[PDB]
Design an enzyme around this catalytic site. Sequence first.
Site, PDB file in Angstrom:
ATOM      1  N   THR C  12       0.823  -1.387  -0.217  1.00  0.00           N
ATOM      2  CA  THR C  12       0.165  -0.120  -0.076  1.00  0.00           C
ATOM      3  C   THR C  12       0.804   1.211   0.038  1.00  0.00           C
ATOM      4  O   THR C  12       1.354   1.731   0.970  1.00  0.00           O
ATOM      5  CB  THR C  12      -0.956  -0.052   1.048  1.00  0.00           C
ATOM      6  OG1 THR C  12      -0.417   0.343   2.411  1.00  0.00           O
ATOM      7  CG2 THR C  12      -1.727  -1.351   1.383  1.00  0.00           C
ATOM      8  N   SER C  37      12.422  -2.240   0.916  1.00  0.00           N
ATOM      9  CA  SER C  37      13.220  -2.375   0.205  1.00  0.00           C
ATOM     10  C   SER C  37      14.437  -1.911   0.198  1.00  0.00           C
ATOM     11  O   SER C  37      15.199  -2.506  -0.456  1.00  0.00           O
ATOM     12  CB  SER C  37      12.820  -1.278  -1.179  1.00  0.00           C
ATOM     13  OG  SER C  37      13.068   0.131  -1.032  1.00  0.00           O
ATOM     14  N   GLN C  38      14.750  -1.398   1.472  1.00  0.00           N
ATOM     15  CA  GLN C  38      16.225  -1.205   1.808  1.00  0.00           C
ATOM     16  C   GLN C  38      16.872  -2.598   2.275  1.00  0.00           C
ATOM     17  O   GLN C  38      17.974  -2.956   2.446  1.00  0.00           O
ATOM     18  CB  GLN C  38      16.584  -0.367   3.258  1.00  0.00           C
ATOM     19  CG  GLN C  38      16.056  -1.089   4.216  1.00  0.00           C
ATOM     20  CD  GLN C  38      14.658  -1.043   4.809  1.00  0.00           C
ATOM     21  OE1 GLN C  38      13.770  -0.856   4.022  1.00  0.00           O
ATOM     22  NE2 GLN C  38      14.357  -1.416   5.941  1.00  0.00           N
ATOM     23  N   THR C  68      10.871   2.569  -2.508  1.00  0.00           N
ATOM     24  CA  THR C  68      11.712   3.421  -3.681  1.00  0.00           C
ATOM     25  C   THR C  68      13.195   3.372  -3.481  1.00  0.00           C
ATOM     26  O   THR C  68      13.839   3.566  -4.273  1.00  0.00           O
ATOM     27  CB  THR C  68      11.151   4.959  -3.426  1.00  0.00           C
ATOM     28  OG1 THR C  68      11.692   5.590  -2.077  1.00  0.00           O
ATOM     29  CG2 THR C  68       9.813   5.243  -3.548  1.00  0.00           C
ATOM     30  N   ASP C  69      13.785   2.822  -2.302  1.00  0.00           N
ATOM     31  CA  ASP C  69      15.123   3.196  -2.074  1.00  0.00           C
ATOM     32  C   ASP C  69      15.760   1.997  -3.080  1.00  0.00           C
ATOM     33  O   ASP C  69      16.879   2.589  -3.427  1.00  0.00           O
ATOM     34  CB  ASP C  69      15.415   2.720  -0.541  1.00  0.00           C
ATOM     35  CG  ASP C  69      15.039   3.611   0.710  1.00  0.00           C
ATOM     36  OD1 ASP C  69      14.711   4.672  -0.065  1.00  0.00           O
ATOM     37  OD2 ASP C  69      15.004   2.975   1.712  1.00  0.00           O
TER      38      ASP C  69
END
Lengths: 303, 302, 305, 302
Positions: C12, C37-38, C68-69
């Site tokens: 989400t 995402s890290q 986004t990372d």
Amino acid sequence: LPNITILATGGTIAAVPQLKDIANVKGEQVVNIGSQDMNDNVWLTLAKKINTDCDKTDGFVITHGTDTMEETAYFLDLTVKCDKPVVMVGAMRPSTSMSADGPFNLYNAVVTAADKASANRGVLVVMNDTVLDGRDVTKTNTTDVATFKSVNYGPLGYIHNGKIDYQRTPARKHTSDTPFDVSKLNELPKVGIVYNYANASDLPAKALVDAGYDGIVSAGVGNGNLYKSVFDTLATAAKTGTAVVRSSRVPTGATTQDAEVDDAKYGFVASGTLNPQKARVLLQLALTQTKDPQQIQQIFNQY
Amino acid sequence: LPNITILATGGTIAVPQLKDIANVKGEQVVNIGSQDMNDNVWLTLAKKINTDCDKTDGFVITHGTDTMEETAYFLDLTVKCDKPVVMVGAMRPSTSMSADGPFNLYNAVVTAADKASANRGVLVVMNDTVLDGRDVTKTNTTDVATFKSVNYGPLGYIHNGKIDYQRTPARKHTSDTPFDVSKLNELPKVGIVYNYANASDLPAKALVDAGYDGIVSAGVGNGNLYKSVFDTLATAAKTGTAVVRSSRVPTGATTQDAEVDDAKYGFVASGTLNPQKARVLLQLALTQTKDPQQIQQIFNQY
Amino acid sequence: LPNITILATGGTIAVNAVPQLKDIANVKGEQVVNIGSQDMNDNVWLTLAKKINTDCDKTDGFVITHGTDTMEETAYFLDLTVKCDKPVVMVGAMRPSTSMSADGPFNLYNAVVTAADKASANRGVLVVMNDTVLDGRDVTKTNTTDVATFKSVNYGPLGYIHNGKIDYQRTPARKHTSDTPFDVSKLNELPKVGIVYNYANASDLPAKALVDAGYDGIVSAGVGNGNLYKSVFDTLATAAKTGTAVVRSSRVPTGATTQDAEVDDAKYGFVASGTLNPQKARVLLQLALTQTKDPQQIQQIFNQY
Amino acid sequence: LPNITILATGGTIAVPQLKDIANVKGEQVVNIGSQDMNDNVWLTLAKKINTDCDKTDGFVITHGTDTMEETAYFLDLTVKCDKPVVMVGAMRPSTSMSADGPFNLYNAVVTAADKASANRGVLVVMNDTVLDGRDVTKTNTTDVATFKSVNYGPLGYIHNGKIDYQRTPARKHTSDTPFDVSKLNELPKVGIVYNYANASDLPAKALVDAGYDGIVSAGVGNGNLYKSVFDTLATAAKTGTAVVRSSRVPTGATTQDAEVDDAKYGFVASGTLNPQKARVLLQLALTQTKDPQQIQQIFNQY
Ligand SMILES: [Zn+2]
Ligand SMILES: [Zn+2]
Ligand SMILES: [Zn+2]
Ligand SMILES: [Zn+2]
């Protein structure tokens, strides 16, 4: 909590419950137009209102259309005498749209007007988490929410989670440190803009001359150069009193003196980093103090 | 080694490493500063290229930087030569310290000599970069790096005489266009008006009274127009003048179905074409049609 | 209306959340993994490419929601390994979904608009952010908080989105998806490739640590044009002569790390990364290492993909 | 004319026109390519400038471009001479076509010889631009325009030997910093580690096991860290290693109150300082204190 006046010049850009946490906001509808129809009367109306109501609030936010917000920002940057913060704000997406930028734009704009750190920094444009000086701020993209930038010398600071980190301040004189005063003007000197391009017609310039325009801004090519026809007209117009400023259609960079135009020989003024619509703002105001090209040049070297 | 013709329009921008990459022959087509560029230079250039196309393996055109982006888009729409045609200039005098002229011309000849450069349209080669003639514009007044394709990026980069092309223009150009300037002596009259706060409708009114075939509007935002200018252009479009909405904003498209009803008024949106670019296309279009929908179709294809 | 699958890797950024979705596509959501995402890793990548490739014929296009990372890393991996030529579109949000003026909802709409556009087919894996369609290879996160952060900083975007319509004007030249020889369908593991940073007085210890662990590959975030500090050079030059593939990339945010630079790559068997930044270099290096250990082959791969 | 001393740290970047603007004396401090830049050159340079300060009117430091942004910020934090000290290099070989060095040097000497340039900290002058030593970074690998102040923009532009300064940095620098290296022979040991998908903890563990004084994390997004590297660096903090979260993302800040609870783990956020620049300040801070909160204050101020 500080008291912040919101001056509206169109419709809503946002409804924003998080404002309560920052300031006691009060709203006024000054005019109601789209910014592509902005004009001198509204500029005077706005500056006089900020200047008169200055002691009655802790600071102003002006909601405004993004299309000419860079022009109105610079006009107020030269004419507001109120030391308190004057912040301008718009939205690139409709308030009813998905991911509308308005609500957070208006919140961050109020954060800036409420921050004591923003006083004595000039008129500000706050957009996309960025605090921008009204002079260098321009719209760079037709649709991007990130469109407002200061393409030459950059932003003044950034807003992260409601706190501004200020790291720059502009050298050019603004607001109460400028000689301009419009409190008793109902009218600004008539100043027009003409574009340059290959085979450019001189008719647009000849028309503004035949109307008795006080000044003309040239949107030149490269470093303020003019098409031969347009060059000849404006040079003739300068010798008969018309102030002419060499700006550039080129989006970044200065139109410099001692470039490819002998400005002294023709009585022309170089605009530096001021793009044409912004060059117009300073020329209008300059024409309220003087018609003399060397003195208009000093002004363009100072504001 | 390939044979490359240089066509000079100025203006010198002495470079002995040319003889390592090509056999160079120079011609002076005209001699002006590019701020005075005009319709007849454009027609002479296009016809010279087309007539001399098969006599050489590529062209480099030296040219003032101020209107290079205008000339490049024109040639890109009218050249019928499928060899490389590469435009180049200098931001510093050839006699200046650290003059960009020499290396800019060297990289221009590299590009024109690269067989991978053909079928890419008319090119602009500046600051180690290959740029398509449509998107390329002058972004800064003095920087040697001024030339950028500000919407869709460059086509390739040059390093040590090698171009790594990673992109090619989607729009149709050169011989894929219906514009044939071969028998033309003049182009439709098209002028440009600026929009801003309180903008006078006089500059637009003057072009109209002079019977101009088209007016391009440097609008505010997504091609919006100050009231006076709007009223005059709307009238102009009803009495036969073609009008195209572009924008003073340096990047991004003036889109149809924006804030202006182009169908209602008979207007054409320029997309990513800036005003001087949109003037180029509108002129050439006004040699094919006068109808707003057909011109819009053209602005959607080229 | 097209059937579009949403595969979530975290959860989400915004279908009841974005009702306009209904006007453009028949959306269905699958939760593939749930990490930040890290902490992205090889196992997620293998799972996504396998998932997309198997389910390719059960839908008209995929949208992947992602942190986004490292969006730009997963996009390039999928770009090299997906064999579904249907639109595969990644999307994220720079702002929390519960936040004022959240970018998530409109990001997701636009991403579905891209997945549904027949014209988005045969472009490789895409990232759609801030009204822009970016190719998985050149796209990178340029700013730590801006909603405009994702930019193709070397060759520009592929198209822009206005009012639900895309205007494509570019297409990437490097071979991608089904034009690559990378096939992960039967792989359970990826070659070990790490990254080391160059800077003044840089320690060679990070590099020695990867070499002492039998790493298949090392990508150097060099200075300038893929240059290397003295110690790091000395170590990585020996690493190469021992069988460790080493790729010279650059910490510098734009521009290529070129062959025939200040570095005699032939002498040491270094490979130049081109415009691939270090984390993207690592992706291609890993995949290159499933086919070859030879430097000359690896340089070719970096010149083709 | 002002007395300007050029200090060389490597080979030449090129200039008779220097005589027209300044009295130029040259010294060769070291001779290395800047990719081999090290703590020693930095200490030599700071002491050189703080000691010869009253011997001249301004300094120009010719320097390789690769680590130019690191030396710039080190000297920005350590020089006590409030006279101008301008750093300059070249992106093109001095022997090459259109070499940028000569004019670069010319503009570096203009900048140093300008009285306006004083009390601005250490300056980097490249491509007609005066950039502050804190924010200037190398943005492109080959472009002559490569140096930019990506977060707050430049201080001034140079046109025909004149600077239009329009900004000045807020952060305290030079004599307004508590850092003193006059008596130091070595600097505290700070390494840099990279974050990426599946990132190994081996680099960070090597730096810990060597008992490094500091570790700067080139994190993902807003200074975030891969699981492995988090665990190791959270462990090294507790046992006394100062760790700074920076970001591999080339623009924007790593902020406190991000996705990492910095106080819980003893982590320092670097703000707009990129990794290599974070190392500069972390090293110097470590000459004054080892305490995580005190090191954070320093990163909020310099
Ligand atoms: Zn101002
Ligand atoms: Zn073209
Ligand atoms: Zn691809
Ligand atoms: Zn400083």
